[PDB]
């Protein structure tokens, strides 16, 4: 089951962005230029001394 | 705020069971505890941001070009102008929304760290002083059963009030 | 005696980005831009047809190839690299306009 | 910051005449006062944001479609593509501008609350201690006329300095 | 945070050699020093934001109109619609990105000011009290060589611990 397509198959994702096909059409996440962007689901990290 | 990577020198890789934890010492030994609220309130925020961006849209859009039987050229350089400029916008907001929601995420760890530190600073009241690395120097006797009363916020300040005001000034 | 407060940390980390610095390490990260492509075309809960050698405009004239899509009932359309609207050579006039309308015609 | 909905347990529904107020107790009674600056500096910010978004634009745009004598279809699916994608943008910024200017609004209430609290913490100096719910436990005598001197920032610390350093340690 | 333009009354126009500096007084005189870390960590941030916006794009776009041999009119009012609406977008983000990166810039000066103030508040420990304008009232003897030990964070708290606990309570 899907709701977004382009000429090379289907884009299934909960994410708001995608770097795949600008001519992707349907109920889609937005197209973006960078290949990947990381959102931290954690706190800062201080490597133990 | 200065907490994480400020005046605390570092974090504790042994604390599996929280983001935030306790670690004490007395005439018994040393033990690594955890704090549920301070860990849990922070978990509530990281996954709140998460449940936002999952909200997708109910606006559908049609294939307007053609990569088999190609359309006209004076129009391709206009659609490839609007689309290649929408590409440059959401590549700007993902540059800004993703860059910000991460910027705003680490600071929810220094305000949840000055919120657990200025509270134990108020249960103990006038019974302990702060040394430098982020601890409360206790000058009275407080064992395994006494520490756990500061943990669950049932510690009473007038319960050990006269001992530490006699071993701190001396 | 001495009591302390502290935070969690590790050394098997990824790196993220902010508003002032770039490349800082964190606890647990998550992706926001999609990179994984399912190559098939997912179609469940909706009726579908595929033309292949038939062109979308071939169901309107009906060359000897679109004889079952003369009346094709569908919620979805697929177009192929070999779709041909024509057997006796020619070309429609304002042909692409008709596809986009037909792309959304349901049959 | 922890002030509102942190270590203050709640707010005071009787304080009509400010956002922020005072509430004391002594050998006379209890009274609910207010603080003009702390209330007023916050009012300056909520209505500053307000005067921004009222700034509209001086760029005019023409009706390009037609809902009486309709235009062509290959172009409607492109204008209804650009317009229905501009719709999706300003529905993203109103999703982000409105979501943020509200996010940034409540935090101007915890920094105006740690700014009135760490100041009275400095006028009193070494003459009072903080209990837990957000008050300063006074151990000397301070009446209706003495409290109003901490209100307008004319209280002198060396004026009651030796009394509270004699009733706090004892 | 309240530091700059809160309880510090003002800044020091003589401090060429930093953003942040020291200024003391004793039985010798007065001198204006500086603090490298607190100045330098702030310089790292102002020029970090700087190195972001310099990152330009690698997407090229062609001239689609014509101001010599003009194109058609029904299309000019659509291109001048998309372009004059993209103009209105980046004039909204420059209205928001520039307005925010400046909003976020001054607050990196109140958290680098409560981070140098609550640290000297911990080296001195229980040996000084804070008056009102943003200073630490020293009640013991600390000369030109003693002050520079609080500067480079080599000051020892148990080194002058019994003198100030004898001149503060008295
Ligand atoms: C890290 O985050 C992901 C996504 O939010 C989650 O599935 C995973 O359980 C998290 N890991 C830990 C150790 O919490």
XYZ file of C-alpha atoms and ligand atoms in Angstrom, chain A residues 41, chain B residues 50, chain C residues 28-30, ligand 1:
19
model
C 16.497 11.964 19.374
C 8.808 13.492 16.248
C 20.291 8.930 19.462
C 19.586 10.433 16.098
C 16.951 10.209 13.413
C 16.572 5.897 19.160
O 15.538 6.569 18.466
C 14.788 5.711 17.600
C 13.809 6.592 16.855
O 13.220 7.571 17.700
C 14.113 4.622 18.429
O 13.458 3.715 17.550
C 15.140 3.877 19.274
O 14.481 2.998 20.177
C 15.979 4.861 20.077
N 17.037 4.172 20.798
C 17.161 4.209 22.129
C 18.329 3.462 22.700
O 16.360 4.806 22.841
